[PDB]
Design a protein around this ligand. Sequence first.
Ligand SMILES: CCCCCCCCCCCCCCCCCC(=O)OC[C@H](COP(=O)([O-])OCC[N+](C)(C)C)OC(=O)CCCCCCCCCCCCCCCCC
Ligand SMILES: NC(=O)C1=CN([C@@H]2O[C@H](COP(=O)(O)OP(=O)(O)OC[C@H]3O[C@@H](n4cnc5c(N)ncnc54)[C@H](OP(=O)(O)O)[C@@H]3O)[C@@H](O)[C@H]2O)C=CC1
Ligand code: SF4
Ligand SMILES: [Zn+2]
Lengths: 64, 51, 144, 69, 51, 172, 106, 338, 162, 49, 57, 116
Amino acid sequence: MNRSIFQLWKPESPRSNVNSKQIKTMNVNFGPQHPAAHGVLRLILQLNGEIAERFDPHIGLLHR
Amino acid sequence: NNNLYYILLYIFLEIVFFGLFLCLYQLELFTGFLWVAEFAIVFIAVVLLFY
Amino acid sequence: SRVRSFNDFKAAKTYIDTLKPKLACLYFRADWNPLCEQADKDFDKLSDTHLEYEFVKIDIDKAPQAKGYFAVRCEPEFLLLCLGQEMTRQTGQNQRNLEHRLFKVQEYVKGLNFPAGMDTYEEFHEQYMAEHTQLDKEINEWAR
Amino acid sequence: VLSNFEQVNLKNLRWEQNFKKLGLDSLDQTALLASIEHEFTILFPDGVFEGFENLEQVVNYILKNINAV
Amino acid sequence: LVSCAIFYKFIVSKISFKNSNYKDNYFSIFSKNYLNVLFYQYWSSFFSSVM
Amino acid sequence: MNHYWGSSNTIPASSTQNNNYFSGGGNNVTIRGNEIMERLPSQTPSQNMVQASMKTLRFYRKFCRLIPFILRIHNIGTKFTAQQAMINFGNYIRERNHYRDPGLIDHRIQLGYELLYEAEMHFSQHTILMQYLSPYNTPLSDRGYSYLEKVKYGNKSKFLQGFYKGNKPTEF
Amino acid sequence: VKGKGSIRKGIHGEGFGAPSHAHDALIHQIKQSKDTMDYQNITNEVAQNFANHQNNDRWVYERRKSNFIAQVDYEYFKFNHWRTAWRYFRNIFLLTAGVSFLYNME
Amino acid sequence: RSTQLKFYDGGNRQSISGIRATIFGATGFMGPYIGAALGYIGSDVIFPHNHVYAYDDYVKELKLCAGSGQSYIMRHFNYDDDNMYDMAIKNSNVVINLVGSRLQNKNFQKAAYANIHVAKKIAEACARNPNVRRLIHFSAAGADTKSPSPDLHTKFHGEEAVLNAFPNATIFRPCTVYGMQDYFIRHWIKERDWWYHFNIVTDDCTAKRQPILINDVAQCVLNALKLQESAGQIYELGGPHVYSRLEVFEMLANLSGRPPKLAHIPHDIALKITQNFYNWEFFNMEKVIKDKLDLIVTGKHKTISDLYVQPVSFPQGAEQFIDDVRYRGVETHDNLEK
Amino acid sequence: MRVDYIVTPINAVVSWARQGSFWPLTFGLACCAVEMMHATVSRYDFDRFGVIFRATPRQADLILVAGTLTNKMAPGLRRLYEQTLDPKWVLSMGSCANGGGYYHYSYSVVRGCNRIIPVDIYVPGCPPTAEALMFGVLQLQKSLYRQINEGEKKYNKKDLTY
Amino acid sequence: GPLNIVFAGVAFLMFYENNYKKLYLNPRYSYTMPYLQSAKITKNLYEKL
Amino acid sequence: YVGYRGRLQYIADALKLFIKGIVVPEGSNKFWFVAIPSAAGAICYTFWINSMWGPSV
Amino acid sequence: MLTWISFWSLIFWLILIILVLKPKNFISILFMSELTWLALYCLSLLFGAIYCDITLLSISFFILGVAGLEFSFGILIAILYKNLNESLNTDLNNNNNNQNIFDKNFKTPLEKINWQ
Ligand SMILES: CCCCCCCCCCCCCCCCCC(=O)OC[C@H](COP(=O)([O-])OCC[N+](C)(C)C)OC(=O)CCCCCCCCCCCCCCCCC
Ligand SMILES: NC(=O)C1=CN([C@@H]2O[C@H](COP(=O)(O)OP(=O)(O)OC[C@H]3O[C@@H](n4cnc5c(N)ncnc54)[C@H](OP(=O)(O)O)[C@@H]3O)[C@@H](O)[C@H]2O)C=CC1
Ligand code: SF4
Ligand SMILES: [Zn+2]
């Protein structure tokens, strides 16, 4: 069991191309008509290889 | 043709025709092996394009 | 030579395609630009000065289709063509720059060599459509 | 670009006048500068954007630019 | 076999160094020497092997 | 800059390059960013009217820079041009000119940035967000208009026009 | 400064780079403002990045596209290019296979 | 008889305009738009229909033209019993007839039934009821007693019959109407998508058209209702400019970027094949016959300017309906983000 | 006339099939959604009547609005209705969907889902029991079975339709 | 046209010549032409079909 | 309840799937959108040749 | 219509020519190299059958192995192209003007050249 910590996380540095996002992130709507989203959850999800990085939960679709 | 996907498809068809020649010339066994190997490779190639 | 004025796109295109000029200068004008008044005089002076070009003026207001056919963006426009192929294009009103462009195109064309049977006149869109079926056609067959 | 702003007369327009004397307030100045900026496909730095007083300075800046298309 | 060993040797060359240049932080500098070495060795090996 | 507007939040030009070789680049001003916005911090408080006016001008500049992208992605370019949309939103801002409380202006600028971000990320509907870009006294360009009430009530004042046309249903 | 190379600490300030090195404004903004951006300020670097990005698509911007001119194609359904192929094929077949076959049959 | 109709147009869906309307033939293209124009200011709308498939969206969405308690859909309409006509317009002070021969139809007897018989029944029922103020009958611009198209001939006869039965009826003759679900732009798109390489033309494309947007016909109807001097008049509705069919093809090609290709088939073969074979929406005699006829404002009657409507230009009004079918060629990197 | 000889029988086979496999869209808002999920489990088996839930609108035959509809959700509901494959039917379940319901006087609630999309049938309760939901679904199934041939055509002297 | 007629003639003669030489001037011991050769049961190694 | 005691459920499902009307979204390649399912069906209707039911059957 | 020996020799050399001809995209060259190895595979099998030699079938499977290892190296090298600031189209990695490319245009990263 050796160290694999560098393979685990990737920081960002100013004006560093290799440390930046070298890919177009998958911005998906975890929207209301989703089996796992219950009824009204519209979660803006940023995926990079099916890894959740950024969340933007839009609520109020059942605010009455 | 310069589209990578079409290049890959045409090379896949070329592999099929190579296997067809081997079948016609009566080296059937080597048609069965070649295809599967290269088929896997072609599959991986497609994934590479997706990246 | 002398300016040939046109208000109909089809008539002007038929005239140009029948003439098949080696060197042509097209002046597209519209009435929204106040500077078009001086451009007419500049075009007339340069037309009487130069004899190797054919000077054709097109009124965009009376022939809107012509604009779409010639990719005109900002009037006044001076389009310089060699054998129907776009040599260069100038937007704005300036006589010195127009004369410089005419002289440059003339000298470069006079320094050119064409193999026999491959120096015929061609229509404008013919250059765009040739590259369209080479690039745009295949791209549209993959995305759509 | 200035044709869209119909409060400006292009007939005898002299380019050294301030934007206000052409009939444009601050919001119209910002809209016109952004329209020219989109037209030439460039960006104006913050100091350059807020330092413009007439169309002559804009013309000179665009003349000195090599990325303008 | 020996060409693969030589490719392995070329791969494990040191890329980044600890030096006294402190002006290059927060800026991206592209070297491209590693890629050229790998590319040319790879394709020369391919051509020689097929012939 | 760890922000949605940061200079490193641009979409890469290719899968192996942020820009061409020998350099970097990206467009983050006239189009949306690469990563999604995850937080929008408060505007720094403005102590006087000058700072509030500067905030308003900068918000308007960002909106004007983002107009063509919004018009393209929302398919509303035929109803009005980019300049017309800028002029209509400028009319909105002009109708909000009488404001004199800097904190209220900071709040309004926050709300404006939020609504602009909603528009540029397809959160809102085009028929809903067009209410801020629509003309005040002019018909939309994508359809015809009726000038019946202009011909009949030609020189009549506003009072007479509002008197001939009632303010309530007449059956009840 | 311990564990900071040649970076020196002055009065009222720790220092962020080696002596006689240029101070970076973007890093100053990063340090002073952790995540606060009042507006998208367009500095020289941002404008340069925009120009660099837009220079990749200069050819598309400068492309002069001509509008189409509609026509009624009266000869589309004749398929003339397939008749030329048929003529070529039958000429080749008659001049190579036909003569030899007839002579050999006789 | 009284042609006066007082109503309040300054309301919304839940207001009371004062108009109680019956609309015939609303299971086509005009129907939803005319019904929405009437019921969006608070009117009561009734839709008599006899539609082959009741679950089709052509019937259900008619319920959306007004709110609950304002829109009613009368099903299983006989179109042959006088009692049903009387029941349909019993409490209506406005009647609109959009019934007409359908494009798929090629039978002369069915064309007369749609254009003459039903219109005559509606006008006769309107005459009997003393509470009907305005009746608007929809016809065609190229309607003529010697037209080779049975639709136009029967529409002229229907104009005569309606004006005879109810001399206070208003006749509308649109030139050709385009929209989201139309037979002009949608048919062009679908024919190009099916015939991937071309659009089929059976003539020289020299026939003239004057397209008008659907949103302008509804405004024309509202203006005619507001104008009391239009009671017994005939109006021809068209766009600002007149184009030939070739020009329309070219304009549609340039607006979307699709390169045009018009494959030509001689007229007589097309006529014979459409005569002797089954006809549906995209293959029928009506397209072949009408493609040689001019459907424009002739100037014999009043025009759209007499209704104080300014129609939008065809290039400007048709652009938004072809946004999805735009040609995807060489584009900038910023165009990848949508 | 002769075409009917083939069309009239086949119509039944077309209806029966679509009556035997009526797949609603997996979409639930608020607590009529919980009641609907109760109506799906073994006590009241929709799978008995060939009713199984599909998650995407492209494979759905029935849209079942089963909860409160806010002004934030109306464009989404309109898009979901438009993106379903024809033919399609819409069921409105509960008070919040049939009308405003317990929030009819609110500032952010659509006063009935029929202001946005057409509705084929309404189920009144709050919540309507699984009994009532099954009743409404069975009624809709019978109606759509009968809806292909309601006697619109007239019979000529040979007892043949048009 | 005349050349089309000539091509059709040559093709028909080729087709008929091939069929004639397959049917006759050829031993018939294996089943190659159906419905023209016998489909009986053969007890010897060499029986003509 | 589809048929008697649910004896025709698969027939009803197949017939309904036939009846449903397919639509191809814009932004997709229509040729590929229709061609991949055809190839998939042609491939899946070949597995039955790679089957064995008794020796050399 | 051509003998198999001459056909396959010509096919191998034509594959090499086409590999050289096509634009220098690393993935395209990888695919064409795989095709070249497969052509060698077929030629070796054909001569093994003609000359009744069992070593050439061994050449076929050894070609399979060598091509597999080479393809793995190529995949890794392309992913390495990702991390370095390089384009998979090598013709875009230099400033040498090329007439074969429609839209080759590179300029210095400066907003302006002259100030006074
Ligand atoms: C291209 C993406 C990557 C491909 C990686 C390798 C894929 C290997 C094969 C997987 C299955 C999918 C391919 C088959 C369906 C698509 C056909 C195709 O690619 O055509 C492209 C080719 C070319 O594509 P094109 O016509 O769009 O291209 C025009 C030319 N350019 C490239 C310039 C734009 O299509 C044609 O030539 C016309 C259509 C012919 C389709 C004939 C087969 C249809 C399907 C029948 C069933 C499948 C075969 C039999 C069953 C299987 C064997 C038992
Ligand atoms: N849209 C256009 O381009 C123009 C249209 N017009 C005319 O305007 C009118 C309305 O237009 P539009 O909606 O587009 O036309 P449609 O053809 O789409 O609709 C025709 C309507 O009439 C009904 N109908 C047809 N035949 C009969 C019949 N025999 N008995 C009873 N009802 C019948 C149809 O119902 P169903 O078939 O379901 O029974 C439908 O409601 C029509 O008369 C049309 O000819 C005139 C000029 C231009
Ligand atoms: S009608 Fe009532 S019980 Fe039903 S979802 Fe609405 S709030 Fe819940
Ligand atoms: Zn008559």
